[PDB]
Subunit: 358 residues, 4 copies
Amino acid sequence: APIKVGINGFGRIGRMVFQAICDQGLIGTEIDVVAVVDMSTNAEYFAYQMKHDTVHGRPKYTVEAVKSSPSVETADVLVVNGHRIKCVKAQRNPADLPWGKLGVDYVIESTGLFTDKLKAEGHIKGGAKKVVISAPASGGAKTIVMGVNQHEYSPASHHVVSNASCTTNCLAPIVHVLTKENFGIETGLMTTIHSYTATQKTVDGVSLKDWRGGRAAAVNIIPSTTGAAKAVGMVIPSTKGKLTGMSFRVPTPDVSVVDLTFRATRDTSIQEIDKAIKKAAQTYMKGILGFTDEELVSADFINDNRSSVYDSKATLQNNLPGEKRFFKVVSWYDNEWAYSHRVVDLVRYMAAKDAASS
Amino acid sequence: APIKVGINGFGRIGRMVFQAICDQGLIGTEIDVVAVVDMSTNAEYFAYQMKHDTVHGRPKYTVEAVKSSPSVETADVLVVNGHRIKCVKAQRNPADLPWGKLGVDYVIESTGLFTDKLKAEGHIKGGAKKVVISAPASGGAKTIVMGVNQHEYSPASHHVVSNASCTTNCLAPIVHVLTKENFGIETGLMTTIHSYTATQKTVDGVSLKDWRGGRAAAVNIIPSTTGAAKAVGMVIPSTKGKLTGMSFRVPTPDVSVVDLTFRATRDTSIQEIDKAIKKAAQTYMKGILGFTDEELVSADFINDNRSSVYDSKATLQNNLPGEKRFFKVVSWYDNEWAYSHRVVDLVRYMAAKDAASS
Amino acid sequence: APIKVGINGFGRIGRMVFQAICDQGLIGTEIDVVAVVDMSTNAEYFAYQMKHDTVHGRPKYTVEAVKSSPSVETADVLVVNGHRIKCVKAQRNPADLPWGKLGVDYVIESTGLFTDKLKAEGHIKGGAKKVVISAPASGGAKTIVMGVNQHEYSPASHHVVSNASCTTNCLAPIVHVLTKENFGIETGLMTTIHSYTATQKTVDGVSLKDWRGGRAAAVNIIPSTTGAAKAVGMVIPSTKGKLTGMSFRVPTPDVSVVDLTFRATRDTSIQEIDKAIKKAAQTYMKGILGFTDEELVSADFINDNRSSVYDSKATLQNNLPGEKRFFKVVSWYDNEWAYSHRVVDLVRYMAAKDAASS
Amino acid sequence: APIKVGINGFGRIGRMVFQAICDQGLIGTEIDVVAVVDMSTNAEYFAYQMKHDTVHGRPKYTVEAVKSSPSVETADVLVVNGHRIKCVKAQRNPADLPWGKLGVDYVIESTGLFTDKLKAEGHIKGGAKKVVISAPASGGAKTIVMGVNQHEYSPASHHVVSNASCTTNCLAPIVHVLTKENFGIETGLMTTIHSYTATQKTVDGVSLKDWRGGRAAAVNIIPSTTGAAKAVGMVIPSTKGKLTGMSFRVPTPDVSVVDLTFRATRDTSIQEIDKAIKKAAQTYMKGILGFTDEELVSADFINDNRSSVYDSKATLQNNLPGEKRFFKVVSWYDNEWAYSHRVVDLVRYMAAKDAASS
Ligand SMILES: COc1cc(OC)cc(C(=O)N[C@@H]2[C@H](O)[C@@H](CO)O[C@H]2n2cnc3c(NCc4cccc5ccccc45)ncnc32)c1
Ligand SMILES: COc1cc(OC)cc(C(=O)N[C@@H]2[C@H](O)[C@@H](CO)O[C@H]2n2cnc3c(NCc4cccc5ccccc45)ncnc32)c1
Ligand SMILES: COc1cc(OC)cc(C(=O)N[C@@H]2[C@H](O)[C@@H](CO)O[C@H]2n2cnc3c(NCc4cccc5ccccc45)ncnc32)c1
Ligand SMILES: COc1cc(OC)cc(C(=O)N[C@@H]2[C@H](O)[C@@H](CO)O[C@H]2n2cnc3c(NCc4cccc5ccccc45)ncnc32)c1
């Protein structure tokens, strides 16, 4: 029984998510992407965008654009590895979307305009069963981070779920084992050296909400606030009010790194922490949290699908010799690639669980 | 009698133009910028943007934001070197602008939405007397390139003028001395290595009109088209249908270079062309066309206000040993800074001539 | 009978060449890289450099560093896909290299210090049979561009061959078909928008020979001279003194594009030229010269091994409507990747022909 | 009595220092730069390098290259604002420099090859009096940070002084007031997002000592270690073994930022710390420690000569709501410009004190 999904909003996020599905070879067999929705239905343009990625290169699958009817002037259907995907026109209100008419049960909300629990529900009123917001959510939506708290998903209570953010998906895993392995965490501050994103400007532009955010992105180091710190508090309750952090947008199109500085509950050492993270990466966190012993740089993590990949050498070489409480942990993450795979993982999980409970 | 001007659209272009007025020390004495119009009237945000520029640095003048009335919650008035500038709320149709009520005679149209002669004329219906479009125009608007054909401006015939484009303001000067010095020009192809601009995207985004133009700007070499070639045909009629060119957008926030390859009418040499350009730069083109004998790079032309600055070394060293017809000329230009000064020079010219003819 | 090859100089060029060999799955079976020579014999460092590449990503083969004798402190042997490569200490004079002692017949001279025919011959005096300079040569060394004039290679006369440069390998193929298909070429000027290289500096630095070439590389458009223009005159005699060109180094780590402007001998059209290049690419130039009908950017050519891939849309869209003589041709090239594959192709060709003639 | 100074090593650092002098308008009157030493004496090249800077732009003073004798083929004398500066030939051993013969008392060691106390003393053996190493020093040399411990300079005991590093000159000031204002500092970890430098590579290159540091600089986030953390322990004794930090080299040619995370001794608040830093910046730290309330970005600090400029907004907005011990402090610094001005200030301080004690 292929999971009927729909993607509302086919921008960087949307496409990435779709590509992640196709990349995992789930298209057709496991997941059926009935359709994608956006301000345009020009399938030829979508194929172009999918076939060529500045950062992620060429896809391992075949993409072609065709016409639903030999009547239509411009393609409106996408064909990935044979499977057919419908390019549907966008709506101002999610409830106006023909989800029920199309047979879509799970809608991936990635337009960034419906991050509010109430507004997102519109998809269900449109005929959808479940909605997964590919970004932080507001309005009391269940936030989940694969590898940290997916077990808290309630098929009967949760209908609008949030996959949090890319940064949160990198920090939470670390914080998760730090607390689970009973290392404790009195308080902590994290800084993320983050690659610039679509919301930024090429040259100095307009940004009334975020003044710094409007400055030339690939020529500046741009400070910015982030909720990934507090958000982890929702996935890991015990950390509420103990964690906070900021971001530094820098001249890279993709891949970011987390720098966590925290104080432990009981005396320990950087070595202990090191081994515990590695051990977790090889056991209950495999696939989500990984690690490296190599002298790597951002470029080396492109297309790495782990939500968080711990940098052992960087960590061990930059802590106090015999410190027992104050530590710094460094973990990388492909802010685009990994997050996308997590959205897929979240959907498959929910679907598998929604079916199990019947 | 200070020229009463109004800037419609206060983005990069609008500000740069305004900064060029201030930088030239014309604010107040020579030019009276009665007001600027944008979707926002937040003078504090405008002050911020003017006081800090990634590429051009800090201004040589003082900029402060004040309140028209102590009642207003957020500053709506800009104070540059004592002169007061009004921050007015934008309108959908230029004709609704209170130009006449503000006493504005010359309007600088730089929103990018009224490049059409018919739409731009709305400012005049709004009360303005003359309009200068800070970009290429359509609908039969007189196009002028200072130092090439300002003498063709007709106070009684032209009311909506276009200052052309940055690139055109770089090529025209060259082509102008090439034809004036009777070198001739059978045909010519020009390629411009241009810095990326506001219309581009930080990361792969949406660009239906220009597909390549949607790719990550600071990380790719992006081919694009340019009308600068044909436009020079309107400023210099003799070149109609003889010129054409293309552009390559590269990873630089500012400063571009023009690579002109053309075939001369009569036998000559690159040394001849070289001496001529330098001669013209020192005489009838001074201030508009300049040149350099130094081993410079793009950064070296930041804040250079000449529309086009000829590169002697680069030219002399890259032509055929004894060629007599087929040549290549290289000239730099600060695509932001110079163009901005030109808009100011055009306004001052129009104003002086409008007044002279009474 | 595995070709015995030795790499002198294991820098960007040398490694790329090596990776090209391994990538083509030639390591061991077809080509035996007996050893690589450099200022360091630290195999662990070389492994690191080969296992991680900022631009080309991770290798498809396995690389491991081991010790020749359990005695040595630091590994001095590289093991790729099982094959053992010796890491040998560099020498001031190539004649001091143990080529004969190692059984090396073909030496890849890529240190950039022995581009002179006389100095390169030192390898032969050292025991080697043939020398391939992975760069433009001087001193009368035979220059060869695969796909254009490899047939002119003489196993008895040519012992020190030059693969030319990346730029020459992109332009020659084009020029080759232009002349072969009898399009003619009175004169021609080419400009290459080239990615920065190892010879450049991160921040303004020292470069007595090339003043401009010493300025911050990733933040400037840096003009420079190129011999790729004249060099094509040696591979395609008929073009001697007819071609010339220049380069513009821009802020990209890899991939460049050639902008060729030329005047044909007989009347023709850009469409004729377009179809001809596409035909040549699909026939006698397949593998060397390719083409594209897509709206691509530099990043799309990363890892493309064709010496030159013609841009059809960019070319057709930027030429004069009904021009018959003056044209512009656009072709891209992964200046690093493709050139490397050519070096390997040159070597295999030579080796096959040296054996045949006996 | 003009301070007789000599610059050994005229690279980025050297020039910067020399330009700092001229910029301050000290050249000639206060400081007499008798000469500069480097592998080359080509004054014309030096003038070029000084008249054009990718990051800092054009100089406010005039630079010209002349010949000591109308005999010499290439200029060997620099003429800034009239003052004459000799361009001397470099030596392998500092003791072989004609410092005594030239009348140079204070030598600025900025070659990076003589950071060792013992080797640097060679300048004094060459006839010099005092030596200032424009970089961290080893061998037990007195390290001083203007605004933090210049008073600890002993004219009779210290003959080889170290101005520390750019990063240390940024963190020290902050830590200084943190301790002086009795906020206390149990332990502290600092991360510095640093622009790339001359030691890095444009494309993946050779770097045996620092493997990651060899990777393409302007296209990666590169982790690295830094002694700036421990170094503050020598300038501020009470901080020994309490501080430690790391660095992240990002794609920016200049300007860096410090992210300090520390635990205080007694209960306090971020607001307290904020007001304290500002107070200190207006009083005893003026000229060394500055601050901003604006939404700035890296580019906004170019040409800022303060050793450290505290970011109040960034700081206040990214700490825990009611935290009393665990805090984060952010401060920018033009790693090139500021440090250079400090070197000059150190020299003027030492000279004024050397003379005072007689
Ligand atoms: C690729 O094709 C194009 C072409 C285009 O230009 C016309 C814009 C976009 C674009 O913005 N594309 C957006 C971008 O790629 C991504 C947001 O991160 O999702 C897209 N997007 C934005 N709004 C969307 C929507 N409903 C909202 C909506 C629908 C109808 C009217 C509205 C009026 C006011 C405010 C909202 C309105 N439904 C689906 N995708 C959306 C995409
Ligand atoms: C700096 O402050 C802000 C804040 C903001 O968001 C709230 C948007 C902008 C912005 O877009 N800023 C634009 C940008 O800075 C610059 C274009 O290069 O001009 C601005 N701009 C956009 N439209 C403008 C206009 N009339 C058009 C117009 C007026 C009224 C309603 C309209 C409805 C639909 C379509 C057009 C409408 N008049 C003047 N400046 C304008 C600037
Ligand atoms: C990773 O290993 C390292 C370490 C290093 O630092 C010490 C430098 C390099 C490096 O420059 N590496 C260079 C770089 O990778 C590449 C040139 O693009 O070739 C390397 N290279 C430079 N000279 C070489 C040589 N013989 C010349 C030579 C050898 C011995 C003495 C000489 C004295 C004077 C003049 C020439 C001398 N043989 C092999 N590779 C060479 C490589
Ligand atoms: C423009 O002028 C040029 C030209 C050049 O190439 C020809 C190299 C440089 C350059 O490297 N320039 C170096 C660079 O700009 C900076 C160090 O970061 O200082 C320069 N530098 C390096 N060594 C120097 C020295 N004595 C040391 C020395 C002197 C003589 C021989 C030595 C042999 C082995 C080891 C050390 C040797 N004295 C002054 N400046 C120096 C500068």
